[PDB]
């Protein structure tokens, strides 16, 4: 809950500043705040199985309808499984309990579908290096609204992908930063406090208000 509370305080602070009514948006850029991980792809098959996704390192995961999670590392071999009760286990495609067979199969189908048919969000973004403190995160929560899909990762990052104009936000409450991908697929990363200081355009402002609403929802559930 601490990640989301932080993010809520950060966003509330920036938004209360009315950053589009001030402009020096480029002064808010902090190139060292680029995220390590985001969701590059997703498939909502919640009608049947659940939500499959791919992170920018090409690792993949599924959050199944039964609230368990299966994660495949980008080595294409190592698996992490998380029961509904939180119990984690570590396995491989090569060595796994019979009980996981089905889910492993489903994960591979998701992988196929995503690899062949979908483009990568942030294809033009080199992710931050990242070190021993940043292990592979998994999808902790997700939902879709009238306007966007909201993806909350276990490292606290919250990603919001807007349906109409393909614009996207990746918020990190550890770095206190936001990456904005616009309709040109240009991306910039800002320190939220610096956005409080120098302000920003109307589009980013609006999307950060919507983001604050989404974080309140995530905190609410």
């Amino acid at each position: 809950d601490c990640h989301l509370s932080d993010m809520l305080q950060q966003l509330h602070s920036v938004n209360a500043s009315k950053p589009s009514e001030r402009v020096r948006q480029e002064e808010a850029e902090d190139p060292a705040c680029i995220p390590i991980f985001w969701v590059s792809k997703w498939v909502d098959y919640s009608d049947k199985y659940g939500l499959g996704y791919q992170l920018c390192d090409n690792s993949v995961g599924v959050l199944f309808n039964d609230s368990t999670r299966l994660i495949l590392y980008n080595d294409g071999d190592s698996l992490q499984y998380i029961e509904r009760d939180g119990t984690e286990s570590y396995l491989t495609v090569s060595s796994h309990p019979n009980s996981l067979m089905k889910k492993i199969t489903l994960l591979k189908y998701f992988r196929n579908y995503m690899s062949e048919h979908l483009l990568k969000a942030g294809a033009n973004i080199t992710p931050r290096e990242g070190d021993e403190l940043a292990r592979l995160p998994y999808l902790r929560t997700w939902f879709r609204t009238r306007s966007a899909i909201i993806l909350h990762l276990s490292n606290g990052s919250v990603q919001i992908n807007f349906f109409q104009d393909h614009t996207k936000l990746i918020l990190c409450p550890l770095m206190a930063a936001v990456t904005y991908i616009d309709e040109k697929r240009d991306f910039r990363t800002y320190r939220l406090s610096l956005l409080e200081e120098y302000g920003c355009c109307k589009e980013l402002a609006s999307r950060l208000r919507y983001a604050r609403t989404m974080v309140d929802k995530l905190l609410s559930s």
């Binding site: 969701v39 792809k41 997703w42 498939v43 909502d44 098959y45 579908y113 995503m114 048919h117 979908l118 483009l119 969000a121 899909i149 992908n161 349906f163 393909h166």
Partner: peptide, 8 residues
Amino acid sequence: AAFSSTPK
């Protein structure tokens, strides 16, 4: 109402 993220 997309089934998935932005396709190729």
